[PDB]
RNA sequence: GGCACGUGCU
């Protein structure tokens, strides 16, 4: 048949959503990491199931003219920048094409124009949050990253796609942790203290939250450590602790503590102040997220009498940025620390017509329906699993004219759009936005409406 | 190998 270590010549014909590398050998589809369309390779077979996968490039016979040859990127490719080996112009085209192909294949839609993916002018150094594991390598505490489905620390200081100030803070903390003899975590032994660093920095404000993810609550001399990090980075307004005593892949455990300062940072979006807790969600590309939100707000054509639902509201960024131009805003968020942020953020921006609830989107929608709230627009911003059929049905029963769907996954978006079409909402506009350059993640704004005029 | 309600997308 074909055996688990064979070398065979193959032509790469397509890219998967995740940035492999599609070939056909014998009868089977193979996924090859770091292989682009139009390339001819010798492929080393890693794994043979029926009727899929998986190979590795042994040799390039012909390379793609769109391949980025940067060796520094090539080390990041599996961990940080999934698509860094493809040129930026082709990353955008690839993301546009995926949206088109999803709407066609899954929802039957071919009659609607999908705009060209809106790209970032300087598609680098954009992330406002870093999550970095801390491990012992050759008896020395090292920071870096993990590759896909691996737990072997790849040392790294320059993360390519994050705020260089965050890189500096991580390195400074790495060196400080060494100077205070704090032991790093070891997954094999379950020994040590420091598991992870999470560092968030406001894109406009520059304010920094450091999170130390530890196995135990007591961190010897941590207050003296903090005094010194604050001295080199006065922008740090918050140092949090998160305790994770389990042996799991999850970064955070249940318990949070405040070690210094506040339990939030403040950053600006669309000219408003937002407080952001450690466990709350905040878009990591603040620049492009503004364009994403502005796109959705423009799609919605909000007027002074509109009633908006901001579902999957987070810290209230979308809803609060429109509440002064609108009659009422109703929002729902699952994470309590984010809902508490959104309530404070309303007060903070002198907003009196926002109503945030801590629930599941689906049974908040059900409550608002039973309470007789009459929304005219529904803004949704779900995670990758999309909306539940229960939410879609319920949102539609309100009779809201416009729905503005912000997606981070085209497969689930297209599924949900299909059901909205069945319920009388026509897909009107689609604008992909590149929130995560150099990665496989695609972000889309869709406008669905039941008005023939839009 | 992953993902979405024993096949559907990747
Ligand atoms: N079933 C659910 N109901 C309500 N919120 C949910 C949820 N599942 C996930 N969430 C939350 O929904 C958000 C998805 S990301 C969007 C957040 C926000 N609109 C912003 O862009 O800033 C996160 O805040 C996540 O914690
Ligand atoms: Zn994805």
Residue numbers in the entry: 1 to 454
Article passage:
RlmCD is a recently identified MTase for ribosomal RNA in S. pneumoniae. Similar to its homologue YefA in B. subtilis, RlmCD can catalyze m5U methylation for both U747 and U1939 of 23S rRNA, whereas these two modifications are catalyzed by two different enzymes RlmC and RumA, respectively, in E. coli. Our structural evidences indicate that RlmCD is a MTase that belongs to the RFM family. All together, our in-vitro experiments confirmed that RlmCD is a 23S rRNA MTase specific for U747.
To learn the structural basis for RlmCD-substrate binding specificity, we co-crystalized RlmCDs with SAM and 18-mer U747-methylated rRNA helix 35 in S. pneumoniae (5’-740GGCACGUm5UGAAAAGUGCC757-3’). In order to trap the complex in an inactive state favorable for crystallization, E443 in RlmCDs was mutated to glutamine (E443Q) as described in previous research. The crystal structure of the ternary complex was finally determined at 2.85Å with Rwork and Rfree values of 20% and 24%. Different from the apo-form structure, each asymmetric unit of the ligand-bound form contains four molecules (protomers A-D) of the complex, in which the electron densities of SAH molecules, rather than SAM, in protomers A and C were well-defined while those in protomers B and D were partially observed. The cofactor in the complex structure was therefore identified as SAH, even though SAM was used for crystallization. On the other hand, the electron density of the RNA molecule can only be observed in one complex per asymmetric unit. A double-helical RNA representing the five base-pairs in the stem region of helix 35 can be fitted into this density whereas the loop region cannot be modeled due to the lack of the extra electron density. In its complex structure, the SAH molecule is enveloped in a deep pocket on the surface of the C-terminal MTase domain while the same pocket is also utilized to accommodate SAH in RumA. The adenine ring and ribose of SAH lay down in the shallow area while the homocysteine part is entirely buried into the adjacent acidic pocket mainly constituted by the residues from α6 and α7, and the residues of the linker connecting α6 and β14. In our complex structure, although the quality of the electron-density map corresponding to the RNA is low, a double-helical RNA representing the five base-pairs in the stem region of helix 35 can be fitted without too much difficulty but the loop region including U747 can’t be modeled due to absence of excessive electron density. This double-helical RNA binds the cleft between the N-terminal TRAM and the catalytic domains of RlmCD in a similar mode as in RumA-RNA complex structure.
